[PDB]
Amino acid sequence: TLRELRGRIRSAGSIKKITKAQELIATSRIAKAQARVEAARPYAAEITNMLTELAGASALDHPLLVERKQPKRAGVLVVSSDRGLCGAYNANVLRRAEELFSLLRDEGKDPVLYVVGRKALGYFSFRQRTVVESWTGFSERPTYENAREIADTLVNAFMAILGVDELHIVFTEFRSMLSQTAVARRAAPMEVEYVGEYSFEPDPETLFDALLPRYIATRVYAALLEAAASES
Amino acid sequence: DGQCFLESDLFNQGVRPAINVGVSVSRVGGAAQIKAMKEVAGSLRLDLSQYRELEAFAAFASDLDAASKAQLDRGARLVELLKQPQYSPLAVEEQVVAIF
């Protein structure tokens, strides 16, 4: 029995060393991901600003801004880690996702799954809920190319092929190093908020149409970066 | 000349008679089996020991090689094949067919 206990002590010491190293590396990567979020913020601010100007000079009738007559289907973009050891992280996302489904089911819209991350993909593969498309390998270190691909697929599904009448993104917001909360945001149809009180080339309507997809791509990118920081 | 190490963990897991394939051994081996069962079950014990080792190794592997996954499936099916309810003896021919 003493041999077993010595072996267990050696195992636990090795695991303590490995987990301590992972903790420190994760601290460094929290720093990196938060720095990337800060770097990406100014572009988001400026694109939001010019979007507000274009909207102030637009009819606000783009499909991304108007509610379908009878929403029968809704997309959900679950952002999840592609490697484990993050504790409740994935669950906290996935649970919230299902909460959203319970809402969507109660509102008569069957959710259609788009998943980012291997862990959520396995989560849904075991509950046999079909994912239309899944992306993997960039939750630890996402790039705007992945965000643009995700946003383009989601927007094409929204415009539509069966398509969707709505789309939500479920992801873990990083508010502080202590707090990391899974939230669900409806990213289309966007609601116009009148906050109260320029030239355009060739016209503000075409710029608005070209920019709304870009704005959604930027917001998906910010969500993915936020999810990466929260994962770390 | 041998040992059939019955383990409580296997018994609870539903592996009955609960023979720990790895530790168990019969040194007479094939000489104590009819030729048919020797042929069908020649490497069964070592195959199951390797399967148990792989299953313990592949407990938390995200993805597995094709050979490893096939080995795990074969071993799981063999383990289910070696389960047997109490007071349900099988004639040797039925055993060779089952292991076949």
Partner: peptide, 29 residues
């Protein structure tokens, strides 16, 4: 035996929220 196994397998029945918004810089619709 192999043929019997295959023909039997032929007949064997296997048991198997917030919202994104566009800020418009005018007071009312």
């Amino acid at each position: 035996l192999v043929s019997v196994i295959n023909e039997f397998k032929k007949g064997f029945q296997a048991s198997d929220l917030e919202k994104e918004s566009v800020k418009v810089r005018k007071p009312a619709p």
